[PDB]
């Protein structure tokens, strides 16, 4: 039989919905079909997410894919904790131990805590957008105490799009007073291109400044603009294009027309979209494991109402969540392995750095080991301290 | 969500009630749409929301003005998460303009069985700087645990 | 555009756009940063004609 799922998509997640249907057609098998019912909304409306998630819970789904915001993570992780319907998502990893939520976007907390150690920073600004938890900021003020850091955090996500140029020019003049030669930009793409336009337009991308774009999509925004000048930026990459699984995808991805797959005719995928391709791999492997060990399941005759009095559990959902957590696929991001909660364990995040040639990977981070240097002991195997023949 | 619809199904003219930092988006989106004008003593929302009436006034203006009153530049800030971080965003932006040395510490994620172990690890990190001005932005049950 | 993209419009540099149309190109881009440009203007907009 085919398998009914739900898709919670934003009105504006174009490339992700393309990379949803790419994983639909490639991972499909004649045994079972992962046939969705796609709904469009904004994730800034808990009224919309509730009216969609109840409409999907009414329309007999066995799992739901979707996105969320700060404005809807608590609408979701209470609903999926209640109605036992599992949920697979590429949004920001929730701060807790929530059941029936599968996080495809890993973590960068200790990784960003690893990198600041690697440069040995002690005094640095930290521009943050609200936009997804605030759990990085809490982690880098928790650790800022016992590591002797002087974080100057600034909320930067309150800025409207007509007083943009005035405030950022007002903003970095404050950090110019405190001799802030290090920034972190805990933003997303649509903001972190705006901030690198303003540190260009006031000319703070010279030698001396140092940046970290603490996203998992370092090469998804326009770093060609800041690529010269002397400001040594850094970053984090999960979609490493030097791989066989990736480069074979970039073949068929770059050949898609932007009429039935809009925003797909390109050579670089957003890490929001790359996990959307990765998540359909995760369902189809687990729903294959459902029919494999003879756990064959029916939905209901009616599926009730979401706001039933009382709204009841259903024991076959206990199998589906446990099936979604035993997944050992390999996807675009690398090793997809979950623990008992739905968060990623044993994954690899590649510490980049932007040089004049371009993006230049000089390490990786894993949960188990550390921030691990990949190769190049010295830049071209130089510096060899010396040998002094003294007496 | 469930109790909101039962009172709208019974035909209320307005709703008094409490929300937390989790259910705040659930309430303010519902009453912003269905016009079920919401009266609350819980903490004021981060921003503008229609049809929400916020009886707890504010704290940011008095908490900043009290800090300038005591002539402060170096102090701690121990917060809970449960009322959002709206106050933490306020004193951290104002620490940029006024050269304060805030040392903010999350403390509200500590459970009952690991109180005395981590609270000693809490105040130890204060003794790395010897900070002696503390802001205990918590609620009543939590501030009694600290005091 | 290129002295922006390599970041040579900071304080210290000084420029002269020796045209008679100083305000005919996009000087909004270099307007901040510290590089004190100069120029020459023949069409002075502070006039009745």
Swiss-Prot record, chain A:
Further details from the record: The postsynaptic actions of L-glutamate are mediated by a variety of receptors that are named according to their selective agonists. This receptor binds AMPA (quisqualate) > L-glutamate > kainate.
Domain topic, free-text comment? The M4 transmembrane segment mediates tetramerization and is required for cell surface expression.
What is one GO cellular-component annotation here?
A: growth cone
Q: What's its job?
A: Ionotropic glutamate receptor that functions as a ligand-gated cation channel, gated by L-glutamate and glutamatergic agonists such as alpha-amino-3-hydroxy-5-methyl-4-isoxazolepropionic acid (AMPA), quisqualic acid, and kainic acid. L-glutamate acts as an excitatory neurotransmitter at many synapses in the central nervous system and plays an important role in fast excitatory synaptic transmission.
**Taxonomy-wise, where does this protein's organism fall, top ranks first?**
Eukaryota, Metazoa, Chordata, Craniata, Vertebrata
Q: How does it assemble?
A: Homotetramer or heterotetramer of pore-forming glutamate receptor subunits. Tetramers may be formed by the dimerization of dimers. May interact with MPP4. Forms a ternary complex with GRIP1 and CSPG4. Interacts with ATAD1 in an ATP-dependent manner. ATAD1-catalyzed ATP hydrolysis disrupts binding to ATAD1 and to GRIP1 and leads to AMPAR complex disassembly. Interacts with GRIP2. Interacts with GRIP1. Interacts with NSF via its C-terminus. Interacts with CACNG2, PICK1 and GRIP2. Interacts with GRIA1 and SYNDIG1. Part of a complex containing GRIA2, NSF and NAPA and/or NAPB.
Q: Keywords of this protein's UniProt record, alphabetized?
A: Cell membrane, Disulfide bond, Glycoprotein, Ion channel, Ion transport, Ligand-gated ion channel, Lipoprotein, Membrane, Palmitate, Phosphoprotein, Postsynaptic cell membrane, Receptor, Signal, Synapse, Transmembrane, Transmembrane helix, Transport, Ubl conjugation
Which compartment or compartments is the protein found in? Cell membrane; Postsynaptic cell membrane; Postsynaptic density membrane
- Segments on the Extracellular face: 1-391
Known glycosylation sites: 232, 346, 376, 383
Question: What is the official name of this protein in its record?
Answer: Glutamate receptor 2
- According to its UniProt record, how is this protein modified after translation? Palmitoylated. Depalmitoylated upon L-glutamate stimulation. Ubiquitinated by RNF167, leading to its degradation.
One biological-process term from Gene Ontology?
cellular response to glycine
Q: In which tissues is it expressed?
A: Detected in forebrain. Detected in dendrites of neuronal cells. Expressed in the pyramidal cell layers of CA1 and CA3 and in the granule cell layer of the dentate gyrus.
The record's similarity note reads: Belongs to the glutamate-gated ion channel (TC 1.A.10.1) family. GRIA2 subfamily.
Here the disulfide bonds are 54-306
> Which GO molecular function annotation, any one, does this entry have?
protein-containing complex binding
Instruction: Describe what upregulates or represses it.
Output: Down-regulated in the pyramidal cell layer of CA1 in the hippocampus by global ischemia.
Top-level taxon in the UniProt lineage: Eukaryota
Which residues of the parent protein does this chain contain?
A: 25 to 421 of 883
**Which species is the source of this protein?**
Rattus norvegicus
Swiss-Prot record, chain C:
Q: Which residues are noted as glycosylation sites? A: 36
Q: Which domain of life is it from?
A: Eukaryota
Tissues expressing the protein: Detected in forebrain. Detected in dendrites of neuronal cells. Expressed in the pyramidal cell layers of CA1 and CA3 and in the granule cell layer of the dentate gyrus.
Q: Describe the PTM.
A: Palmitoylated. Depalmitoylated upon L-glutamate stimulation.
State what induces this protein.
Down-regulated in the pyramidal cell layer of CA1 in the hippocampus by global ischemia.
Can you say where in the cell this protein is located?
Cell membrane; Postsynaptic cell membrane; Postsynaptic density membrane
Instruction: Report the protein's function.
Output: Ionotropic glutamate receptor that functions as a ligand-gated cation channel, gated by L-glutamate and glutamatergic agonists such as alpha-amino-3-hydroxy-5-methyl-4-isoxazolepropionic acid (AMPA), quisqualic acid, and kainic acid. L-glutamate acts as an excitatory neurotransmitter at many synapses in the central nervous system and plays an important role in fast excitatory synaptic transmission.
Q: What is known of its domains?
A: The M4 transmembrane segment mediates tetramerization and is required for cell surface expression.
Q: Quaternary structure per UniProt?
A: Homotetramer or heterotetramer of pore-forming glutamate receptor subunits. Tetramers may be formed by the dimerization of dimers. May interact with MPP4. Forms a ternary complex with GRIP1 and CSPG4. Interacts with ATAD1 in an ATP-dependent manner. ATAD1-catalyzed ATP hydrolysis disrupts binding to ATAD1 and to GRIP1 and leads to AMPAR complex disassembly. Interacts with GRIP2. Interacts with GRIP1. Interacts with NSF via its C-terminus. Interacts with CACNG2, PICK1 and GRIP2. Interacts with GRIA1 and SYNDIG1. Part of a complex containing GRIA2, NSF and NAPA and/or NAPB.
Q: What else is known?
A: The postsynaptic actions of L-glutamate are mediated by a variety of receptors that are named according to their selective agonists. This receptor binds AMPA (quisqualate) > L-glutamate > kainate.
What's the family? Belongs to the glutamate-gated ion channel (TC 1.A.10.1) family. GRIA2 subfamily.
Q: What is this protein called?
A: Glutamate receptor 2
Source organism per UniProt: Rattus norvegicus (Rat)
Instruction: Summarize which stretch of the complete protein this chain spans.
Output: 221 to 269 of 883
């Amino acid at each position: 039989n085919s398998i009914q799922i739900g898709g919670l998509f934003p009105r504006g997640a174009d490339q992700e919905y393309s990379a949803f249907r790419v994983g639909m057609v490639q991972f499909s098998t004649s045994e079972f079909r992962l046939t969705p019912h796609i709904d469009n909304l904004e994730v800034a409306n808990s009224f919309a997410v509730t009216n969609a998630f109840c409409s999907q819970f009414s329309r007999g789904v066995y799992a739901i894919f979707g996105f969320y915001d700060k404005k809807s993570v608590n609408t979701i992780t209470s609903f999926c904790g209640t109605l036992h319907v599992s949920f697979i998502t590429p949004s920001f990893p929730t701060d807790g131990t929530h059941p029936f939520v599968i996080q495809m976007r890993p973590d960068l907390k200790g990784a960003l805590l690893s990198l600041i150690e690697y440069y040995q920073w002690d005094k640095f600004a930290y521009l943050y957008d609200s936009d997804r938890g605030l759990s990085t900021l809490q982690a880098v003020l928790d650790s800022a105490a016992e590591k002797k850091w002087q974080v100057t955090a600034i909320n930067v996500g309150n800025i409207n799009n007509d007083k943009k140029d005035e405030t950022y020019r007002s903003l970095f003049q404050d950090l110019e007073l405190k001799k802030e030669r290090r920034v972190i930009l805990d933003c997303e793409r649509d903001k972190v291109n705006d901030i690198v336009d303003q540190v260009i337009t006031i000319g703070k991308h010279v030698k001396g400044y140092h940046y970290i774009i603490a996203n998992l999509g370092f090469t998804d925004g326009d770093l060609l603009k800041i690529q010269f000048g002397g400001a040594e930026v850094s970053g984090f990459q999960i979609v490493d294009y030097d791989d066989s699984l990736v480069s074979k995808f970039i073949e068929r991805w770059s050949t898609l027309e932007e009429k039935e797959y809009p925003g797909a005719h390109t050579a670089t995928i957003k890490y929001t979209s790359a996990l959307t391709y990765d998540a359909v791999q995760v369902m189809t492997e687990a729903f294959r494991n459902l029919r494999k060990q003879r756990i064959e399941i029916s939905r209901r005759g009616n599926a009730g109402d979401c706001l039933a009095n009382p709204a009841v559990p259903w024991g076959q959902g206990v199998e589906i969540e446990r099936a979604l957590k035993q997944v050992q696929v390999e996807g675009l991001s690398g090793n997809i392995k979950f623990d008992q909660n739905g968060k990623r364990i044993n994954y690899t995040i590649n510490i980049m750095e932007l040089k004049t040639n371009g993006p230049r990977k000089i390490g990786y981070w894993s949960e188990v080991d550390k921030m691990v240097l990949t190769e190049d002991d010295t830049s071209g195997l130089e510096q060899k301290t010396v040998v002094v023949t003294t007496i």
